[PDB]
């Protein structure tokens, strides 16, 4: 069928969301771009540039008003009248992230806040920051923009969380229409906006080393893989994600096997999960 138009806007992000998506195995990223979505604007990968790229997005947004999906990566800085994140220039005026979200936010079918920065503020909003880094849902709500927001957090998210949420939403819309389908998607979001299929279970409660935790057998060095990682700083007890069985990068590892979980999907990441290397 017709692939929905998608605009991918980067605010105060590190592009790790885009890179993690490039690591999707099934479907591959080529299948996603050629068969699932129509990625009409994405500054990292798109052919055109500059004001032409901005104008192309605006033309698509006009043609598919209320029907395009807006992926937001990174936080939205509101200090200094938005000047800490300029994303383009057209007709001799700079476009801040603030401006862009106010322009396209109201007209999207839905906003997918990908990554912990976009979902909850993340590192750019952490202690010591001074740009007014703001979560997408908070920014839209503070400005009276009612467009539904789905949070797909993680620093970075797993590719499956991004692709899987898109597939879930497109399935819902196929069977119920846009408004009916988005209603169904919102029903499977937890109180932090996260789809329960990927974020509904606790890492620690499903951890393979829980037996060592219960027995008090703790690793004293990172390279001791017999013990539980709690004394080394593992934040699995306070983290809701399915990494314990989904694993990372084609199943070759995950954070707890390799070192510790740092709670990267949680709304208080990083400050509420720090220091990373002590309990």
């Amino acid at each position: 069928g017709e692939r929905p138009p998608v605009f991918w806007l980067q605010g105060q992000g590190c592009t790790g969301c885009s890179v993690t998506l490039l690591n999707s195995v099934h479907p591959s990223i080529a299948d996603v771009l050629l068969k699932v979505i129509s990625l009409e604007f994405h500054p990292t990968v798109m052919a055109w540039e500059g004001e032409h790229a901005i104008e192309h997005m605006r033309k698509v947004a006009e043609k598919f008003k209320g029907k395009f999906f807006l992926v937001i990566e990174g936080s939205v800085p509101v200090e200094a009248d938005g000047k800490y994140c300029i994303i383009g220039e057209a007709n001799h005026h700079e476009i801040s992230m603030v401006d862009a979200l106010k322009e396209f936010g109201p007209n999207a079918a839905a906003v997918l806040a990908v990554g912990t920065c976009a979902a909850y503020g993340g590192i750019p909003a952490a202690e010591g920051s001074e740009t007014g880094a703001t979560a997408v849902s908070k920014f839209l709500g503070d400005n009276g923009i009612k467009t539904p927001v789905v949070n797909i957090p993680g620093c970075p998210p797993h590719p499956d969380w991004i692709v899987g949420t898109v597939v879930l939403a497109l399935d819902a819309i196929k069977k119920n229409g846009l408004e009916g389908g988005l209603a169904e998607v919102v029903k499977v979001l937890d109180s932090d906006g996260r789809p329960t299929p990927f974020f509904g279970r606790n890492i620690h409660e499903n951890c393979p080393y829980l037996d060592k935790y219960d027995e008090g057998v703790m690793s004293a060095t990172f390279t001791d893989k017999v013990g539980c990682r709690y004394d080394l700083g593992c934040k699995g007890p306070m983290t809701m994600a399915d990494c314990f069985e989904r694993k990372w990068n084609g199943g070759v590892n995950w954070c707890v096997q390799n070192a510790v979980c740092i709670g990267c999907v949680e709304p208080d990441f990083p400050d509420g999960k720090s220091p990373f290397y002590q309990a």
């Binding site: 592009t15 500054p43 798109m46 052919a47 540039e49 750019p124 202690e127 096997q257 070192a259």
Partner: protein, 482 residues
């Protein structure tokens, strides 16, 4: 003809937020300004934290090159803590980091740069584009480029599997900490790494390096532009023993046709044209300060202006390959002869002008990828399965350390000062900072700004060579600003 001024914001098929503004007169760029438009302030966010947090926090500067920041950070922490990394952990770190060189260079040529020369499929994000995009390849060769673009998507993913085998995941490894690496390689996982490495090697040797020379041979005019200052920096990277003196890339500076030693005390960061407080200009990184000033008159970027003893230098594969002058790949030697009529054995046999050029920087990156294959092959023979890779040092109350390495895009250092067992200062001087910075306090342009001078613009409605030049440097403005 007279002047046309062209602003490009966003510059696409780079990482991060960049505006380029060029003055074109009589068909050539005669002036340029680069503006990095997004700021986060990692250097102030980091203050007050447990120093060990840094090796996670700093990776979020950039999700394309996080292993570089991880490496610079743990090296800085290693020095500050007095951590003596076990030899097997040194090798494991090299295997983690080296695999992302392969990922990053392949990503850059195919998924960022190749569309400069190849027409992609007739659907977004490969259309719309400039109606006169100067795409010269035959239908056959163009299709080959698209096929390799698609294959390269799988190859770069496999490279991140290699990173994650001992790094935990990617982007943002868990496997590098102060004191070494957190997971001892097993025989089984070394076989898994090696098997993936063999597939990457085949692609690099049979597809990537050949296609860069082949496309270059259809764009020979692109070796005659983009010289800039012809000045380069390398700070050293990938230790090959625990002496601290033998490295895969040795340090050196090259400027005004002369090789010179690298002395890090000569680095100063200027801010006259950067959105930071005027009083902070001219600081070495050991005294660095980051005070944003987004309303400062006359400034035009969140990138500071690093200078080396007053010199404006570039960094990256060209810089490292020129400074170190390794033997060229067998592929390169043959295609330089057959396609360019060039007899060359070592990298510098390209000549300064051709090496320091738009297309020369793509060739350097391809040659460097081939060079890295040999290093990874050696580390796979050197590593000892089962030998411990980490020590567990106490956090000091007072300390300082500097970590130097080479990110895929160029020289990277992190400096940390610890006081009361917490970060008192953390300063980052990164690769695309050296390349994509604005003018310094005396008005001397940054490396890419200068390399844009002379770029041909025969058609101001299709000014494609401006961003082509920029993309040759593989910019990353998240890294440049942090």
């Amino acid at each position: 003809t007279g002047r046309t001024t062209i602003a490009i914001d966003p510059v696409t098929r780079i990482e991060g937020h960049l505006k380029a503004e060029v003055v074109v007169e009589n068909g050539k760029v005669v002036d340029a300004r680069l503006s990095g438009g997004m700021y986060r302030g990692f250097e102030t966010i980091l203050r007050g934290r447990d120093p060990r947090d840094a090796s996670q926090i700093v990776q979020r500067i950039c999700g394309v090159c996080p292993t570089a920041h991880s490496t610079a950070s743990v090296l800085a922490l290693d020095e500050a803590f007095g951590a003596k990394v076990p030899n097997n952990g040194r090798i494991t770190r090299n295997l983690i980091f080296g695999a992302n060189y392969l990922q990053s260079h392949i990503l850059h040529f195919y998924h960022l740069s190749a569309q400069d020369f190849v027409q992609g499929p007739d659907t977004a994000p490969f259309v719309p584009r400039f109606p006169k995009s100067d795409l010269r390849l035959s239908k056959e060769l163009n299709k080959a480029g698209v096929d390799q673009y698609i294959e390269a998507l799988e190859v770069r993913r496999i490279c991140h599997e290699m990173v994650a085998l001992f790094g935990g995941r990617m982007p943002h490894v868990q496997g590098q900490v102060v004191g070494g690496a957190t997971e001892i390689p097993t025989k089984e996982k070394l076989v898994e790494y090696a098997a993936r490495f063999k597939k990457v090697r085949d692609f690099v040797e049979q597809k990537y390096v050949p296609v860069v020379y082949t496309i270059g041979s259809k764009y020979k005019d692109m070796f005659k532009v983009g010289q800039g200052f012809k000045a380069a920096l390398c700070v050293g990277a990938f230790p090959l023993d625990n002496s601290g003196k033998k490295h895969l890339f040795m340090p050196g500076v090259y400027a005004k046709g002369k090789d010179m030693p690298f002395d890090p005390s000569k680095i100063k960061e200027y801010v006259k044209y950067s959105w930071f407080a005027e009083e902070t200009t001219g600081l070495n990184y050991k005294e660095g300060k980051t005070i944003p000033a987004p309303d400062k008159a006359g400034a035009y970027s969140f990138v500071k202006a690093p200078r080396y003893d007053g010199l404006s230098l570039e960094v990256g594969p060209l810089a490292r390959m020129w400074v170190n002058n390794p033997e060229l790949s067998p592929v390169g030697k043959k295609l330089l002869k057959d396609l360019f009529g060039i007899s060359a054995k070592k990298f510098r046999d390209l000549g300064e002008e051709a090496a320091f050029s738009l297309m020369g920087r793509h060739v350097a990156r391809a040659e460097e990828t081939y060079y890295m294959l040999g290093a990874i092959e050696g580390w796979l023979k050197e590593i000892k399965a089962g030998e411990d890779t980490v020590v567990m040092p106490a956090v000091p109350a007072s300390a300082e350390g500097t970590g130097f390495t080479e990110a895929p895009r160029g020289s990277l250092l992190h400096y940390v000062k610890v006081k009361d067992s917490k970060i008192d200062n953390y300063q980052i001087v990164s690769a695309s900072l050296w390349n994509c910075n604005p003018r310094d306090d005396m008005g001397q342009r940054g490396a890419v700004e200068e390399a844009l001078i002379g770029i041909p613009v025969d058609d101001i409605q299709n000014p494609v060579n401006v961003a082509r030049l920029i993309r040759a440097f593989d910019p990353x403005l998240a890294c440049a600003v942090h």
